[PDB]
Amino acid sequence: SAAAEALRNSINIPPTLYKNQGERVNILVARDLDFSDVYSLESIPTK
Amino acid sequence: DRGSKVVGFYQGGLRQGQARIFVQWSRIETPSGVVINLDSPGTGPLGEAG
Amino acid sequence: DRGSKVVGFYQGGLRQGQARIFVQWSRIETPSGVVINLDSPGTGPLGEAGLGGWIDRHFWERFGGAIMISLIGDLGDWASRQGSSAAAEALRNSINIPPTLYKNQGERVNILVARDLDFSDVYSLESIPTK
Amino acid sequence: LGGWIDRHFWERFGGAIMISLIGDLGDWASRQGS
Amino acid sequence: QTREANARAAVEAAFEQRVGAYYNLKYMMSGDKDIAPVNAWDDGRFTYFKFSANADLPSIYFVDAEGNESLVPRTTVGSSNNIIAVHKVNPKWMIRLGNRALAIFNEAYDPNGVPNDTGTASPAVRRVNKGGN
Amino acid sequence: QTREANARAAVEAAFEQRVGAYYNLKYMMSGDKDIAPVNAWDDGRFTYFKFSANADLPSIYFVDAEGNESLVPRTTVGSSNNIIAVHKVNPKWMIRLGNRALAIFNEAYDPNGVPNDTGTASPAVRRVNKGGN
Amino acid sequence: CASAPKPKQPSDFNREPVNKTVPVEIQR
Amino acid sequence: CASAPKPKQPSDFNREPVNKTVPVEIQR
Amino acid sequence: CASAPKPKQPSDFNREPVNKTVPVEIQR
């Protein structure tokens, strides 16, 4: 059958996702992030 | 900081029945020059995977 | 302590007939900085294995191609007869779509501890002097 | 241990039942052309 | 080493000392009285259910504001293991053994409770951060 | 080794100072009041929800102008870990625990707030770039 | 069309005090 | 035809102050 | 038939100055 042939040859077309710009997302931190080499803390003298 | 730029990537496309793509964020860059390699999953606003 | 952040993960997705996903909780961090690797099964509020929520079985994605193919074929036959298989291929190709589980934020879950957790190196007890 | 058993009757048979019924209904409509 | 053994002795003494606790006894039950405790009370931190010697020890569940039951951690105390301490104070509980069920009600529920500033089950003992780091 | 210990001591002193701060207390709630905090405030930098000793600590979510909830980072503070401090000042908040929900409203929202010129949670501690480079 | 049953719910009619005498662990 | 349910939306009728008292953390 | 939706277009009714006050970074 021609119709069954066309379906068999074009039925598996994976979908496409569209996400607009400017939308809010998260990042779930997967590992411990160590910031000990690039910052240090100091007290600000009063006045 | 705020305004730090995160860079990530996706690949592989979707399958039938899937409505979310897996995004891996790779590196963030603080506005003062601090780069850290966070290879973390990118989720939705409420933690949905992908 | 209360408010300790437990972090876990799932993978593999559901199969047909399943309504719960296996979640493994991997590590817990106490508000005071104590960190212990508990590799435990995640359960529901009464200890039933897996996290379960609302299931999307994708009925239309699985069956609508076959249904529409049959309806188009039948309507075409009606029109052609009024002058005076593709459906099986669509079903074969789109029938095996695994379900998707949705679980809302803020729901209660349990962690059933699978191994003995030892806290002898991070805590000690001292008596509080009276008065 | 034993308890209550969900045999998943609909998840197992509803696809076949529904496909058969829709095929039969389409056939009936196509017969009703005249 | 000497101060450690002294600390342990003092800690045991303070755990046993048991001063300054208030007790709620306004607990009521309805259901299958065959699986019922002989006594229920709480000290503000834990809830205790005493069962007699000839009674099977049941399973006890946390009932929330909407009716849903959930697990609560459990300790079995008393000289003859006749007391079940659940680690929570709650207005409603559910006792289940087989196909029998019993509802326990806290008729004097205190939403505030008493804060746990020490890290232990007693105000006279403190949990301190040994691990340093 | 010595000047670093001095700097550490000064930094802890400055964090524990917590001076010259202004507190907003105009918070309202509406919903499932059984999971409500006993107190909620903010100091222009973080928002604090204080819960009683017997209350389960719920999940707290960030609500935007359209009503969509989103995760907000959290830290649990207080002597008895009774205070949930979220790292944002917002007009509306969402509290969830199981199938209960409570909405917290900030009735004195300041769209400006206090700028974070120092890189820490305190105006008396400066975050400096050790890494140089 | 069929879902798993629920456990027995206790009747809410015969509500009575648990404590008919004060426990002795309270030292009374 | 069906989508995943939202979580419970709280009712906006019983709106009341959170703070019946002043926290001691404010030093008040 | 169906195409990807566009992001929300802002209204053009409530047009007003951004700068109610001169920024301080202008040193003014």
A4 close to C (CB below 8 A): yes
SS3 B10: strand
Strand ranges for chain E from DSSP E: 27-31, 39-42, 47-50, 59-63, 69-70, 74-77, 83-86, 92-97, 100-106, 125-129
**All structural domains of chain E with their residue ranges:** 3-133
- Give the whole-angstrom CA distance, residue E69 versus residue E85: 17
A15 close to I (CB below 8 A): no
Residue F20 DSSP one-character state: S
Contacts of C8 (CB under 8 A, 6+ apart): C23, C24, C25, C26, C42
Beta bridge partners of F27: F106
- Give the whole-angstrom CA distance, residue B17 versus residue B31: 40
Contact E28, G15 (CB under 8 A): yes
Residue A3 phi, psi dihedral angles, 5° rounding: -65, -45
- Give the whole-angstrom CA distance, residue G26 versus residue E113: 19
Contact E50, E40 (CB under 8 A): yes
**Tokens 């009757």 — which residue?**
D9
Residue G2 phi, psi dihedral angles, 5° rounding: -125, 130
- Give the whole-angstrom CA distance, residue G23 versus residue G28: 6
Beta bridge partners of F86: F47, F74
Which tokens in the block code for residue B39? 């290879």
Beta bridge partners of C42: C23, C111
CB-hemisphere CA count at 13 Å for C85?
14
CB-hemisphere CA count at 13 Å for B14?
14
Question: Which candidate, E37, E38, E40, E47, places its Cα nearest to that of E25?
Answer: E40
Q: Which helix (H) or strand (E) holds C61?
A: helix C59-81
Contact F106, F24 (CB under 8 A): yes
Beta bridge partners of F127: A41
Does the beta-carbon distance from A12 to C86 stay under 8 Å? no
Does the beta-carbon distance from D6 to G1 stay under 8 Å? no
Which tokens in the block code for residue F9? 């001591």
Those chains having 3 or more beta-carbon pairs within 8 angstroms of chain F are A, B, C, E, H
User: What does the radius of gyration of chain B's CA atoms come to, in whole angstroms?
Assistant: 13
Contacts of F105 (CB under 8 A, 6+ apart): F27, F28, F29, F30, F91, F92, F93, H15
Which tokens in the block code for residue C90? 């669509």
Q: Which helix (H) or strand (E) holds F92?
A: strand F92-97
Contact E15, E27 (CB under 8 A): no
Contact F90, F35 (CB under 8 A): no
Cβ-Cβ contacts under 8 Å, F116 against chain A: none
Beta bridge partners of C55: C101
Which residue pairs, CB below 8 angstroms and at least 24 apart, start in C18-26? C18/C99, C19/C52, C19/C55, C19/C99, C19/C101, C20/C44, C20/C48, C20/C49, C20/C50, C20/C51, C20/C52, C20/C101, C21/C50, C21/C51, C21/C52, C21/C101, C22/C49, C22/C50, C23/C50, C23/C51, C23/C109, C25/C111
Of F70, F125, F131, the CB nearest to A41: F125
CA distances from B29 to B8, B23, F127 (A): 12, 18, 17
Q: What is the DSSP string of A1-40?
A: -HHHHHHHHHS---------TT---EE---S----TTT-E
How many Cβ atoms sit within 10 Å of the Cβ of residue F93? 23
How far does Cα E106 stand from its chain's mean position?
13
H helices within F1-133, ranges in order? 2-17
F93 close to H (CB below 8 A): no
Cβ-Cβ contacts under 8 Å, I9 against chain A: none
Would you call C63 exposed, middle or buried from its count of C-beta atoms within 10 A (0-12, 13-18, 19+)?
buried
Beta bridge partners of C126: E126
Cβ-Cβ contacts under 8 Å, E40 against chain G: 18-19
Does the beta-carbon distance from H23 to F41 stay under 8 Å? yes
- Give the whole-angstrom CA distance, residue E126 versus residue E119: 6
Q: Which helix (H) or strand (E) holds F42?
A: strand F39-42
Which residue pairs, CB below 8 angstroms and at least 24 apart, start in C88-91? C89/A4, C89/A7, C89/A8, C89/A11, C90/A7, C90/A11, C90/C65, C90/C66, C91/C63, C91/C65, C91/C66, C91/D19
F117 close to E (CB below 8 A): no
CA distances from B9 to A28, B1, C66, G16 (A): 15, 22, 36, 64
How many Cβ atoms sit within 10 Å of the Cβ of residue I5? 8
**Tokens 């780091």 — which residue?**
E133
Contact C45, E68 (CB under 8 A): yes
CA distances from A33 to A30, B34, C34, E17 (A): 9, 12, 16, 45
SS3 F114: coil
Mutation target among C57, C91, C93, C97 for the B interface, most CBs of B within 10 A: C97
SS3 C125: strand
- Give the whole-angstrom CA distance, residue C56 versus residue H4: 8
Which tokens in the block code for residue B3? 């305004």
Beta bridge partners of C100: C56
Contact pairs from chain C to chain H, CB under 8 Å: 12
Cβ-Cβ contacts under 8 Å, A31 against chain B: 38-40
Cβ-Cβ contacts under 8 Å, F105 against chain H: 15
Resolution in A: 2.9
- Give the whole-angstrom CA distance, residue E62 versus residue E73: 10
SS3 C3: coil
G7 close to D (CB below 8 A): no
- Give the whole-angstrom CA distance, residue E97 versus residue E92: 17
Residue F3 DSSP one-character state: H
CA distances from G9 to E33, E67, E93 (A): 13, 10, 12
Which tokens in the block code for residue E79? 């000289």
Mutation target among C127, C130, C131 for the E interface, most CBs of E within 10 A: C127
End-to-end Cα spacing for chain H: 55
Question: Which candidate, C65, C75, C77, C56, places its Cα nearest to that of D19?
Answer: C65
What b/e readout covers F15-51, taking b as 16+ CB neighbours within 10 angstroms?
eeeeeeeeebbebebbbbeebbbbbbbbbebbbbbbb
Beta bridge partners of E101: E96
